[PDB]
């Protein structure tokens, strides 16, 4: 806040600015595809 | 309207010990000189 006051009028304590803290947590977006060894070995696509 | 000093900052670092009381003040003035040179329009509030 910014106060106005006057000539010869005492000055009140203005409220100090506030600070906010955003906690951006990290979280693992994992992929766990259980492919069989059958597909990898049999196919010529190299499915990995 | 501003003053020649403009904005003055007095970093009060003596009076309340353990406290920096920053005192920053600017002398500001504002008046409608020649009101014929400004026009207002109050649109419907809706």
Question: What does this 3D model show about the protein?
Answer:
- This is part of a larger assembly, with two copies of chain A.
- Chain A is largely without helices or strands and 48 residues long.
- In chain A, 12% of the residues lie in helices and 0% in strands.
- Chain A contains one helix and no strands.
- Chain A has one helix at residues 37-42.
- Chain A is rod-shaped.
- Chain A starts with 36 loop residues before the first helix and ends in a 6-residue tail after the last helix.
- The chains hardly touch.
- Chain A: It comes from Escherichia coli O157:H7.
- Chain A: This is Major head protein.
- Chain A: It is found in: Virion.
Tell how many strands the DSSP assignment of chain A holds. 0
Percent of residues in beta strands of chain A? under 5%
Cα end-to-end separation of chain A = 61 Å
Q: Looking at the structure, what is the overall shape of chain A?
A: rod-shaped
Which sheet architecture does the biggest sheet of chain A show?
none
Oligomer: part of a larger assembly
Helix content of chain A: 10-25%
N-to-C series of helices and strands of chain A = H
Secondary-structure class of chain A: little secondary structure
Characteristics of this structure?
part of a larger assembly, 2 chains, 48 residues, little secondary structure, Major head protein (chain A)
Topology:
The structure is cut from a larger assembly and holds 2 copies of chain A.
Chain A: H1 37-42
Subcellular location (chain B): Virion
Protein name (chain B): Major head protein
Organism (chain B): Escherichia coli O157:H7
């Amino acid at each position: 806040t910014v106060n106005h006051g006057e000539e010869g009028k005492t000055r009140e304590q203005t409220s100090t600015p506030q600070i906010n803290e955003v906690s951006i947590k990290l979280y693992p977006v994992y992929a766990y595809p259980r492919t069989t060894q059958e597909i990898v070995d049999f196919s010529d696509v190299d499915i990995l | 309207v501003d003053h020649e000093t403009g904005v003055r900052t007095r970093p009060d670092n003596l009076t309340e010990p353990g406290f920096i009381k920053i005192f920053t003040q600017k002398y500001l003035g504002g008046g409608v000189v020649d009101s014929n040179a400004i026009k207002i329009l109050e649109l419907p509030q809706d």
